[PDB]
C-alpha cells in the first residue's frame, strides 16, 4: 500500500467526527494528524 | 490476529497496531505459497531462488 | 545584506522538507505510523538533521 | 595562509577514510556486505560524516 497523501479508497475503522471551523483543534484528516484553524478557503483546487 | 497460532506479520514502512489508523491510497494482496525457509526471502532486499 | 539575510531564512524553511533518511519529513506521519522504538529512530534523524 | 588553505584541504580528504561508526569508508563495500534497507542506515551514517 502507498502511504503518499492522495484520494483514499481505503481507511481503517474509525469514526469521523464534526467538522468544526474558525476554532483552534486537533485534526485528523484520512490520516492526516495536525494542529490548528480550519477555515472556509479560497482556494481554487482542481476537482482532483 | 486472529489468523493462524504464530503467524509472522512483519510490516516495512509501518507499526502492526497503527494500520487501524491510517487510510490506505491503493492497497494490493499478493498471495501464494512457499517454504517455511524461504519466508525469509520475502522481504525487501532480500537473496534467494 | 537585505537579500543575504532573506535567502538565509528561506534556505532554512527548505530545509524543512529534507528528511535527513527518515522515512517521511513530516513528525505526525512518522509518528502515526510507527511504534514508539522505530518512531524514535526516525525523529532523531530528523530532529538532529 | 597557503599552509591553512593547503591543510584544510587535506583534512577534508583525510576525512574521507573515515568510517564515521560505520563498518567501512567505502560505500560500494558497505552496499555489497550489507543488506539494502541496513546497508542504506550506515550509508546515511556515512553521508552525514
Redesign the interface.
Known amino acids: 500500500f502507498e502511504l503518499l497523501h492522495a484520494p483514499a479508497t481505503v481507511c481503517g475503522p474509525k469514526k469521523s467526527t464534526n467538522l468544526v471551523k474558525n476554532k483552534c483543534v486537533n485534526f485528523n484528516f484520512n490520516g492526516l494528524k495536525g494542529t490548528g484553524v480550519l477555515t472556509e478557503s479560497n482556494k481554487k483546487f482542481l476537482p482532483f | 490476529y486472529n489468523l493462524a497460532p504464530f503467524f509472522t506479520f512483519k510490516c ?17 494482496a499478493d498471495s501464494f505459497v512457499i517454504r517455511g525457509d524461504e519466508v525469509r526471502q520475502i522481504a ?3 537473496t534467494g531462488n | 545584506v537585505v537579500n543575504h539575510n532573506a535567502q538565509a531564512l528561506n534556505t532554512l524553511v527548505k530545509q524543512l522538507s529534507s528528511k535527513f533518511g527518515a522515512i517521511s519529513s513530516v513528525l505526525n506521519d512518522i509518528f502515526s505510523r510507527l511504534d514508539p522504538p522505530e518512531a524514535e529512530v526516525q525523529i532523531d534523524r530528523l530532529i538532529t538533521g
Not at chain 2, 12 to 28: A, I, M, R, W
Request: hydrophobic share 25%; net charge neutral; aromatic share 16%.
Open positions: 516495512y514502512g509501518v507499526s502492526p497496531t497503527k494500520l487501524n489508523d491510517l487510510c490506505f491510497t491503493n492497497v494490493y525487501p532486499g532480500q
